[PDB]
Structures are given as C-alpha cells and as structure tokens.
C-alpha cells in the first residue's frame, strides 16, 4: 500500500476495531498470516529462501 | 480400455442363501451409500416372495431371470452421417446385468409405496411374465429380429 496508509496503520487508532494487519515487509492488507506477520507472497519467498526457522515444503 | 481388457472383480458369496445372485442384486439396488438398508430391503422382498408364492426364493428368482434374460441387443454405429442399429449377440454376464438393471429400474415406478413389496411383486410378475421389464425384454427381442436388415457390416 501507500506510505501514508502504512504509517496510519502503524499509528494508534482512537477506536479498538479500527486496526488491521498491514503486512510489514510490503504493506499488503489481504492474505496476512498472524503467525508470521508476512503476506502470502513474502511468506512463500522467504520459505523458499530458507530464512524462516522451521518452514519447509509440505509433501504427504 | 485402449490397451487391453480390464480385470474382473471377485464376487463375495452370500452367507444367508449361498448364491451370488442375491449379493449382485443388493449391489445393483444399492443407492446413496447405505449397504444395511439395501440388504434389509432385498431380504424383506425375498421373505414376502417366500410367504406369497409358496416356493423357494432362489428357484423363482432364477426363473424370473430366465424370463428376463435376453439373447440379442442393439448397438448404434454411425457411418457417412447415418447411424445403423446393428443387432449383436450378448455375453451371459451382460444379459444378467441387463436383467437385474431392468428389474431394479422398473422397481421404482410403482405406486405401491414401499420398496420391499415392489420387488416381491415384480419378482412374482416376472416369474409369471406379468412384469414391465419383461415387456421391454420382448421389445428388445422384437427389434433384434426386426432390425436384421443391418448385419453385413459386422461391427
């Protein structure tokens, strides 16, 4: 998203419900995993890069 | 089926009557994925035939099968924009499968409101030739010796 939107998401809301995830690395509000804080695209990229301690290709 | 013929499944014998016919029938009548209902339905039909006709269910079932078993069928093959209904003889397995299919198919168009006596009634009719599937059996035979005009292709 835009820089202003990213900062306004980082800003303290005056209401409890006005908060959303807003993935840290890129700023994409859709499809954000709360376990990692990374969106699906960045999750895939870092999982393939081996930079997340424990994630790996799933096969069964 | 392009490479070669498919393998044939084994048939488990029945523990109550000892004939593969009843297990084949319960497999054919099975619907929606409930065996127990299926064998209870077919066994109820067998018992009602038992109490009605006064003879054994196996012998009358086999007699009905013979009365419904066909010998010739019709196969449609197209050439030059025209489809021809060639008559072809039938392997015994296909004959039995068609007989059971016809019985169960005409088991479901009745008005007498529950499956068990529907099956029993048609078993009795097919034993006596009074059924509806039998009508289609002599119909198929009628077109078997009626559509003899297309046999030199041999396909």
């Amino acid at each position: 998203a835009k820089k202003a939107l990213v900062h306004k998401a980082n800003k303290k809301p005056k209401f409890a419900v006005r908060a959303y995830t807003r993935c840290n690395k890129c700023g994409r509000p859709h499809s954000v995993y709360r376990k990692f804080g990374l969106c699906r695209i960045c999750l895939r990229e870092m999982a393939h890069a081996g930079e997340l301690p424990g994630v790996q290709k799933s096969s069964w | 089926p392009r490479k070669g013929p498919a393998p044939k499944r084994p048939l488990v014998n029945d523990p109550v009557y000892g004939s593969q016919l009843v297990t084949q029938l319960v497999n054919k009548v099975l619907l929606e994925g409930k065996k127990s209902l299926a064998e209870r339905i077919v066994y109820g039909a067998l018992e009602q035939a038992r109490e009605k006709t006064g003879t054994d269910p196996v012998v009358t079932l086999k007699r009905a099968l013979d009365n419904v078993k066909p010998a010739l069928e019709v196969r449609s093959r197209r050439v030059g924009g025209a489809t021809y209904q060639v008559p072809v003889e039938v392997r015994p397995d296909r004959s039995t499968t068609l007989a059971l299919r016809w019985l169960v198919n005409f088991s479901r168009q009745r008005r007498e409101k529950t499956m068990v006596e529907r099956l029993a009634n048609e078993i009795l009719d097919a034993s006596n030739g009074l059924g509806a599937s039998v009508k289609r059996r002599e119909d198929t035979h009628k077109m078997a010796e009626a559509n003899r005009a297309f046999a030199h292709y041999r396909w």
Binding site: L38, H48, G50, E51, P53 | -
Partner: protein
C-alpha cells in the same frame, strides 16, 4: 513460471537454513527484526559483494555472520566501517551483536558473486555474450565444480524487446535432491531498466 527455487527444494535434504532460533510469543517480532536488519545490510554496503547473511539469536545474545567476497572494504585496518555497521544496528536496537564477518576462499565458485560480477560487467556496457563466456571459463577453471548454467533476461543490448539468453556447460541435474546445486540470483541496473541474472553451479553429490 516453471521451475521452483533449487535452494528451497532441498531445504531439508541437502541445504540448510539461513536463520536459526526458536520462539513462540515473539516469533513475529523476531522475523520482523530479521527482515529489518537484512534490508539494512542489503541497502548499506554494495561495493563489496555479500555472499550470505546469517542471523543467530538466543536471549539477549545475537550474532550476525556476514559472508562477503573481500572483507578489507568491509573492515578497514582502523575498523571504521565495521563499527559503523555495529552502530547502525545499534540505532535499529538489535541489542548486542557478536558481529562476525567472513571471507570466501573461492569467489569464482560462488553463484551469487558470479552473478554480481556479470551484472556489474553488464552495467559497464559490455556485450553479454562475452561476459558469460568469461564467467563460464573462470568458474570451470576451479576443479571441484562439475557444471554451470548462466542466464540473463531483460533488455539486452538496449533493444526495445525482451530477451532471455542462457549458456550452459557440464552437468546441472536440478531434478536430483542429493546434488549440491548452488543457486545465485542478482539484478543489474542499466539505463534502460532492469536485468536479471541467474546462475546454477553443480558441484558433485552428497551422501549421508
């Protein structure tokens, strides 16, 4: 989109992880700190090629392993720039770090460094084919390597048309899990835009 990342394909068979630690409650904070420090390291120093950046973190103790081509640019005799990196991390507040910087004994056999060299030579407005010739020759000079494939995609030669060109030598069996295949991707900045360089280096198999 056809091939998956060879490094990620063998993340539990041949290759190892890049960052190692354990956390449940502060997993998100740890990963965000990792991405922040990795972005800082990637942005800051570029004249010296960085082969790898690994992070270790337990309790207050942290240590960063920076594998680079030559550490002299990254560490002067007076150690101004090493302490500069230390202080840059300190402003980021990664607490204390046992900062370790290591040089590589075979800069010609590292896919990332070869990709960086090809990218910089393309930035020098050199013909791409000559750069791939020299890169392949230099890489195959080293004995232990057994194959190399080098590909570049983009607006090669300044033309207004996409082009992807690949040159290979030896064996590069990507479809084998027990093959030590080093994969290197890098980007070349040119006047007309972007160029992508990918290098596969196959150096024997591994048996456990």
């Amino acid at each position: 989109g056809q091939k998956i990342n060879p490094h990620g394909f063998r993340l539990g068979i041949t290759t190892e992880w890049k960052s190692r630690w354990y956390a449940d409650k502060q997993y998100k904070d740890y990963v965000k700190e990792d991405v922040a420090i990795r972005k800082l390291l990637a942005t800051g120093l570029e004249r010296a090629g960085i082969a790898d950046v690994e992070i270790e973190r337990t309790r207050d103790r942290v240590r960063v392993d920076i594998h680079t081509a030559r550490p002299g640019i990254v560490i002067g005799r007076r150690g101004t720039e090493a302490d500069r990196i230390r202080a840059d991390l300190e402003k980021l507040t990664g607490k204390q770090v046992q900062l370790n910087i290591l040089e590589v004994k075979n800069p010609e056999s590292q896919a990332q460094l070869v990709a960086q060299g090809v990218a910089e030579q393309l930035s020098n407005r050199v013909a791409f084919r000559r750069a791939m010739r020299k890169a392949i020759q230099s890489a195959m000079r080293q004995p232990n390597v057994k194959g190399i494939r080098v590909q570049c995609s983009g607006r090669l030669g300044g033309a207004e048309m996409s082009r992807s060109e690949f040159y290979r030598e030896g064996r590069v069996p990507l479809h084998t899990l027990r093959a030590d295949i080093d994969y290197g991707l890098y980007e070349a900045k040119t006047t007309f835009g972007r160029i992508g360089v990918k290098v596969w280096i196959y150096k024997g198999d591994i048996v456990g």
